[PDB]
A paper describes a structure:
SARS-CoV-2 uses the receptor binding domain (RBD) of spike (S) protein to recognize its host receptor angiotensin-converting enzyme 2 (ACE2) and mediate cell entry. We measured the binding affinities of rabbit and hare angiotensin-converting enzyme 2 (ACE2) with receptor-binding domains (RBDs) from SARS-CoV, SARS-CoV-2, and its variants and found that rabbit and hare ACE2s had broad variant tropism, with significantly enhanced affinities to Omicron BA.4/5 and its subsequent-emerged sub-variants (>10 fold). To elucidate the molecular basis of rabbit ACE2 binding to SARS-CoV, SARS-CoV-2 PT and Omicron BA.4/5 S proteins, we solved the cryo-EM structures of rabbit ACE2 in complex with S proteins of SARS-CoV, SARS-CoV-2 PT, and SARS-CoV-2 Omicron BA.4/5. Q34, a unique residue of rabbit ACE2 compared to other ACE2 orthologs, plays an important role in ACE2 recognition.
Author numbering:
A (entry chain A): 19 to 614
B (entry chain B): 329 to 500
The structure:
Amino acid sequence: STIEELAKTFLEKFNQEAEDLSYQSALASWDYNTNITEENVQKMNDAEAKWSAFYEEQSKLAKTYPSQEVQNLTVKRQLQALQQSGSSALSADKSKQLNTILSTMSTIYSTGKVCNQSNPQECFLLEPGLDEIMAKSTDYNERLWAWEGWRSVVGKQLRPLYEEYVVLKNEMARANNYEDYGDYWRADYEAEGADGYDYSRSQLIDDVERTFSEIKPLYEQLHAFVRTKLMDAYPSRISPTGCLPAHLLGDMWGRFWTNLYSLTVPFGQKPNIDVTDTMVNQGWDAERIFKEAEKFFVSVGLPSMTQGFWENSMLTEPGDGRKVVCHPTAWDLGKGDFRIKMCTKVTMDNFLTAHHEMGHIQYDMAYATQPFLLRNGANEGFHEAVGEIMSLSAATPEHLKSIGLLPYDFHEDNETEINFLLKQALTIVGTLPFTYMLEKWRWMVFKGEIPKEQWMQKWWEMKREIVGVVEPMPHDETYCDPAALFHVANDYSFIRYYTRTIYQFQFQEALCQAAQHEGPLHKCDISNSTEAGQKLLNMLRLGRSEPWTLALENVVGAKNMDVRPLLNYFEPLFTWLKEQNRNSFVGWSTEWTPYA
Amino acid sequence: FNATKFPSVYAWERKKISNCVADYSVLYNSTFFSTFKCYGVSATKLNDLCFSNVYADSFVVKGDDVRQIAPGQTGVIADYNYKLPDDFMGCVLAWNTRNIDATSTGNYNYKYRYLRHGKLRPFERDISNVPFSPDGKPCTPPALNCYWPLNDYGFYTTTGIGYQPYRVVVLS
Ligand SMILES: [Zn+2]
C-alpha cells in the first residue's frame, strides 16, 4: 500500500519502545554512578545490552522502505536518522573483529605506564601524575621526556590496530553505498529543506576554511605576545621568531594554553575580583550558590528549575563514605527527569560551573516536546555553545556588585578589564587551529588521497602550516601521533569544538545587541533584560526538527557561520596588542626545529 | 468512596450516581488537588441546579495528557482511547499520585492504545486485541508489517512533573 502509513506506524512503534528502554538504561547508569560497587555494573551492562540489541535489530529493518518516496520532511528526517546505524549491515564476524579491535585499542590506551628519571618502580600512569606535572612544571627536560616516552609507548602500541581499522571502516562505509568513513562523519551537517536553506556535506570543507582565514590575524597577534613573553621564562631556548615548541603549552598535547597566565601577566601589582574570598566571610554554601544561579536565570525570562532537581540531584560530597567520581555533569534521563551531579566547593570556579551546567539543563528542557528521534541539538556544537554565554555574562563586575560580593564604590579599574580579556583569550582562541588540523588530517586519511606509508610525516607538515607548532623530536612512520589523544583512541568527532566556539560568540553578540548595551561587549550582562532571553528561547525550542541553517538564522540573522562578533569581542585586546607589539607579529617560517 | 485500585485508560471505570447530593466544598483551602476545571458551568448557576443522574469516569494518565481531556485537543489518546463530547460538559479533576502509584523499581500495570482503523465517536469503548495491519491482509503475528496495538506506560517515582501517574476523574 502507501509507504507513508507504513513509515508512520513503524516510527510510532520505535518511539513507543525507545521511551522505555532508554529510561531503564539511564536509571541503571545513574544508580551505578551515585554508588560504585561490584554489583551495579552488572545491572548497567544488562540494561545497555538490551537497549543496544533492540536498537540494532530495529535500525536496519526498515530499509525495505525507501527514503526517496517520502513526502513529509518530518517522517523523512526520522527515517534518515534511523537508517544510518553502522556495522550492523556487515557480517557478524566482521562486527566481532571491529568490536575486539576497539576494545583492545581502548584498553591499551587506558593502562599506559611511563617510568623513568630514577630507579624504575614509580608508575605515574596519566591521570594521577602526568596532568599535574604538565600543568605545574617549569623545567624543559621533564616535560620533554614525559612527552616523548608517552608517545613512544602508546603510538607504537596502537598503530597497527588503527592501520587495519581504517581499512575495515572504509569497507564498511562502502557497504552502505557511501564513499568513505570521513564522509559518514561529515554527513551530520548534511541538511535539506527549502530552496535556499539546504546544505550539502561537500560544502563543509568550503565553509570551515573560509572562516579560518579571517581568524588568522588575531591568533597571530596572540602568538607573538606569548612568544615574546617566554623570553623572560626560558632564556635562550625558544626562538625569537620560530614556532612554539610542542611541550611548553601547559598541557600534554596543546589543546588549551590556560595555564600560562602565571608566566604572562599584564600587571602583577593588582589582583582579580573575588578570587576565593568573601564567601568564607559571608558564609555561603552550595544551596545559596544554586539559588543565586536560578535567580540570575529567572531575571532574564527563562523558566525556573523544578523541585525534583532539588530533591533527587546530589549537590555535595556524600557524608556516608560512598566512593564517587562526581565529575560535574548534567544528566537528562528522559521522561522529563533532569539532574546535576557535582561535588560543591566555595571557589569561584564552582560558582561559574553551576551557571554553565544550569544553561545545559535549560537547553535540555528546551526541546522536550519534540518527538523522540529528534530530541538533540541542531548539530554537535549548539549544545555546548548555549551553556558558555551564561559563564561569560556571570563574571562581569556589574553582576558581582549587584549581588553584594563586591564593594559598591569599587570602580572598573583599567587593568582588570584587560587582565580578564587576556585570560579568556588564553583559552578560547588557542583551541581553534588544533581542532581544524585534527579534523582535516583525519578526513584526508579517510579520503584515501594520502597513501598508507606517508601518514605521519604529512601530519607533522600541517602542524607547521596552520597552528605553528614544531615537533620536539623526529618521528618516523612507526609512530601514530593522534593515537595518543583520547578522542582518537576512542574514535569521536572533533569539529564540534570549532563550531561551538564560533556559535557561542555569534549568540552573545546578537543577544547583547538586543540588550541595548552601549560600550564594549566585555561588560555585557543580560540581567534586567528580557529581549535576549526571548530571542534565545525562540531558537532553543526547535531541536533537530529543522535544518541547522534556519536554527542559526532565528537569532543571528545569517544562514552560515560568521566570525565578525568574535573579532569584535577582543577589539580592546586587539588594539592593546598592536600597540605593545613593535616587533614580532610577522608570522612564522617553517624551517626552525629544536633538533636541527 | 475511594478505592486503592484504579483501572487503565482503555478500561476506564464508569460509575452511575443517582439520588445523591454532594458539595465537595473543601476545594477552597485544598492544595492537594493538582488541577480542577469546569466547562459547562462556572459555579454561578450552582444555586439553581441540583445534581441527579450523573456519571463518573475514572482512569490514570500522564501529566502531558491531562490537557487532552477536553473538547477538541486532538492529541493522540483523545481520539483512540477516550473522546470528549462537544456539548455535554461537566467538570474534570486530576490529582497527583507519585507517592503511591510509583515504585523505584517500576510499575507496568497500566496500558494504553495507539493504533486503530477509523476515528472514535463519543462514548465508544474498544477492548478487543486484534493484530493491526496497515494494508488489510489479516496477519499471523509476529509476521512482518503486522504490529500490536497496545503499550504500557511505566510510571516510576523519580520521573519529571508531567511524566507522573495522575488520577483523573471526569464528572458528567
Ligand atoms: Zn558543558
